[PDB]
C-alpha cells in the first residue's frame, strides 16, 4: 500500500491491467482489502471502467460483489451511478445483492432514479430491485426521480406500478417535491397514472 491505501491489485484495476491482476489473484493476493476510502479492487475497475479487471474479478470467487467503500457504496451502486449498463448487468447475473443500499439507505435503485439512469432502472427492477424501497430519509426512488427531474426513469417506476403515495420524512409526495422544484412535466406525468 501507499499514500492512498492502493495495493497492487488496486492498482492493477485503476491501469487496466488484465495480465497483472490474474497474476496477483493466482499468488492468493486479497481482492477485497481496502483503500483509504474503503474502495476494493473491484470499486476500482467500475470506477475507472476497466473491463479486463472487472470480469477478472468477478470470475473470482472470493471477491465480495456486496464490498461496502466507507460510505456504504457498492459497485452495483457506483455502476448505476456512473451509468455503467454492461457491468451493472453483469454484476446483477453474477448474483450482486439488489437490494443492497449506502449508509444513507440508498440502493441503486434509488441513484438510477436520481440520475436519470432508464436503462440500470430497468434491469434493476427486471431482477427483484423493491420499487417502493424507503431511505433512511423515507424517500423512494420515485420520489428521488421526481425531485431531480428524471422524467424518463419516474416513468419506468411509474409503468411499474410504484407508490405514488409514499412521503418522505416531511410528509411530503412525489408530486409535491417535484411541484416545489419547477418539474411541471413530471407533475402532469405523475397524474397520468
Same mark, same amino acid.
Given at each position: 500500500?501507499?499514500?492512498?491505501?492502493?495495493? &497492487?491489485?488496486?492498482? &492493477?484495476?485503476?491501469?487496466?491491467?488484465?495480465?497483472?491482476?490474474?497474476?496477483?489473484?493466482?499468488?492468493?493476493?486479497?481482492?477485497?482489502?481496502?483503500?483509504?476510502?474503503?474502495?476494493? +479492487?473491484?470499486?476500482?475497475?467500475?470506477?475507472?471502467?476497466?473491463?479486463?479487471?472487472?470480469?477478472? @474479478? @468477478?470470475?473470482?470467487? &472470493?471477491?465480495?460483489?456486496?464490498?461496502?467503500?466507507?460510505?456504504?457504496?457498492? +459497485?452495483?451502486?457506483?455502476?448505476?451511478?456512473?451509468?455503467?449498463?454492461?457491468? @451493472?448487468?453483469?454484476?446483477?447475473?453474477?448474483?450482486?445483492?439488489?437490494?443492497?443500499?449506502?449508509?444513507?439507505?440508498?440502493?441503486?435503485?434509488?441513484?438510477?432514479?436520481?440520475?436519470?439512469?432508464?436503462?440500470?432502472?430497468?434491469?434493476?427492477?427486471?431482477?427483484?430491485?423493491?420499487?417502493?424501497?424507503?431511505?433512511?430519509?423515507?424517500?423512494?426512488?420515485?420520489?428521488?426521480?421526481?425531485?431531480?427531474?428524471?422524467?424518463?426513469?419516474?416513468?419506468?417506476?411509474?409503468?411499474?406500478?410504484?407508490?405514488?403515495?409514499?412521503?418522505?420524512?416531511?410528509?411530503?409526495? +412525489?408530486?409535491?417535491?417535484?411541484?416545489?422544484?419547477?418539474?411541471?412535466?413530471?407533475?402532469? @406525468?405523475?397524474?397520468?397514472?
Amino acid at each position: 500500500t501507499d499514500r492512498t491505501g492502493e495495493t &497492487a491489485l488496486h492498482l &492493477a484495476a485503476r491501469y487496466s491491467r488484465s495480465d497483472a491482476a490474474k497474476r496477483l489473484l493466482e499468488a492468493s493476493a486479497d481482492a477485497n482489502i481496502q483503500d483509504n476510502m474503503g474502495r476494493t +479492487p473491484l470499486h476500482a475497475a467500475v470506477s475507472a471502467d476497466a473491463q479486463g479487471v472487472f470480469q477478472i @474479478l @468477478l470470475r473470482n470467487r &472470493a471477491t465480495d460483489l456486496d464490498a461496502r467503500m466507507h460510505d456504504g457504496t457498492t +459497485p452495483l451502486i457506483l455502476a448505476a451511478r456512473l451509468a455503467l449498463e454492461g457491468m @451493472l448487468e453483469d454484476l446483477i447475473n453474477s448474483h450482486a445483492d439488489v437490494n443492497a443500499v449506502d449508509d444513507l439507505g440508498k440502493s441503486a435503485l434509488h441513484w438510477a432514479a436520481a440520475v436519470n439512469n432508464v436503462d440500470a432502472a430497468v434491469v434493476l427492477l427486471k431482477n427483484g430491485a423493491n420499487k417502493d424501497m424507503q431511505n433512511n430519509k423515507e424517500e423512494t426512488p420515485l420520489f428521488l426521480a421526481a425531485r431531480e427531474g428524471s422524467y424518463e426513469t419516474a416513468k419506468v417506476l411509474l409503468d411499474h406500478f410504484a407508490n405514488r403515495d409514499i412521503t418522505d420524512h416531511m410528509d411530503r409526495l +412525489p408530486r409535491d417535491i417535484a411541484q416545489e422544484r419547477m418539474h411541471h412535466d413530471i407533475v402532469r @406525468l405523475l397524474d397520468e397514472y
